[PDB]
Design a protein around this ligand. Structure first.
Ligand SMILES: Cc1cc2nc3c(=O)[nH]c(=O)nc-3n(C[C@H](O)[C@H](O)[C@H](O)COP(=O)(O)O)c2cc1C
Ligand SMILES: O=C(O)c1cc(=O)[nH]c(=O)[nH]1
Ligand SMILES: O=C(O)c1cc(=O)[nH]c(=O)[nH]1
Length: 336
């Protein structure tokens, strides 16, 4: 049916209850013939990035399908790639509810989920049963109780288990909803993490006889100097790619709006400009040494093209998918 009516109905429910209802129906049809109800034709626009071939530049950002339960249904919708997760070594409930809020007038969202997921072992089993033909990205992170200074082991543990089933691996060290998680992107802490990750990738390549690229997901709340250091570190350690950007703690564009003071990360339209400008500065520093996957407030063909012009090789969407639904996918892929 007409998505606006779909949205109209969904927006009457609590934000998370709306997501749970939606995924309840998707899981109900994913991998079955019902899948035709959400499927849509999309032209192919192949892009080579990180040694991989993406059928099209548009991907589903991480956070929607955290446990990889609806890979096939979502894929049928047209996405060139799908990023599942964030997943942690052990299952965890996440923060207390409510943890998700809508800013309808700003076409944005604020969340403090806290990595609510069923664990990496469960996710691996879901992936084994999926038939998706696009690129599958697996996004991983640290369990809440794991001391952030020993967080590196949680990443390595997940890497060992998903290596054989991932198109690329996404390292999440930018979530604002896990205490201390963002500290991992600064100084020696970042260098030590990247050193371990690249070494683990090296061992896994010898074990599985194949190279699985790794991309690091950074926050949008980094200063010019910090952004330069991160970019340089990524280059020195030969990281395969960088995903910019995650949600922001900034609230300067949503003052005076309902839920504007809720704690958490802000996404959607209010993140669009900040995100694009970070991509541009990032791209300037990287100087083509490694690709950028741009994400943040993309809600139209032009917004996507702006990210590409700023320097991104690929783009992902989340919030915009919730406000504009399936039609957005078709629009971007068709005209990007
Ligand atoms: C409800 C929700 C859950 C998310 N969970 C994650 C997650 O688990 N892992 C991750 O890397 N990013 C997560 N994000 C961030 C998105 O993947 C994306 O980086 C950010 O929302 C910017 O894109 P958007 O403006 O198009 O939503 C989440 C965002 C939202 C709104
Ligand atoms: O009702 C439809 O046709 C429909 C709904 C939806 O969410 N996606 C799609 O491609 N079609
Ligand atoms: O699950 C979460 O709380 C979460 C993770 C992340 O990386 N970004 C975000 O906005 N929320």
């Amino acid at each position: 049916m007409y998505y606006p009516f779909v949205r109209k109905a969904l927006f009457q429910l609590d934000p998370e209850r709306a997501h749970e209802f939606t995924f309840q129906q998707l899981r109900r049809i994913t991998g079955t013939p019902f899948e035709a109800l959400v499927r849509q034709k999309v032209p192919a626009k192949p892009v080579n990035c990180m040694g991989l071939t993406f059928k099209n530049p548009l991907g589903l950002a991480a956070g929607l399908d955290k446990d990889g339960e609806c890979i096939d249904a979502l894929g049928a919708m047209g996405f060139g790639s799908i990023e599942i997760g964030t997943v942690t070594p052990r299952p965890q409930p996440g923060n207390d509810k409510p943890r998700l809020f809508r800013l309808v007038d700003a076409e944005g969202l604020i969340n403090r989920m806290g990595f609510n997921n069923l664990g990496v072992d469960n996710l691996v089993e879901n992936v084994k049963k999926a038939h998706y033909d696009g690129v599958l990205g697996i996004n991983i992170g640290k369990n809440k109780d794991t001391p952030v200074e020993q967080g590196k082991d949680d990443y390595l543990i997940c890497m060992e288990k998903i290596y054989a089933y991932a198109g690329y691996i996404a390292i999440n060290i930018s979530s604002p909803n896990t205490p201390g998680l963002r500290t991992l992107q600064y100084g020696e802490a970042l260098d030590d993490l990247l050193t371990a990750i690249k070494n683990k990738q090296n061992d896994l390549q010898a074990m599985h006889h194949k190279y699985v690229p790794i991309a690091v997901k950074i926050a949008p709340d980094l200063s010019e100097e910090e952004l330069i250091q991160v970019a340089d570190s990524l280059v020195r350690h030969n990281i395969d790619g960088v995903i910019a950007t995650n949600t922001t703690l900034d609230r300067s564009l949503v003052q005076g709006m309902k839920n504007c003071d809720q704690t958490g990360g802000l996404s959607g339209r209010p993140l669009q400009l900040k995100s694009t400008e970070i991509i541009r500065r990032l791209s300037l520093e990287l100087n083509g040494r490694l690709p950028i996957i741009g994400v943040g407030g993309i809600d139209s063909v032009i917004a996507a093209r702006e990210k590409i012009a700023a320097g991104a090789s690929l783009v992902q969407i989340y919030s915009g998918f919730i406000f504009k639904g399936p039609p957005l996918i078709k629009e971007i892929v068709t005209h990007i």
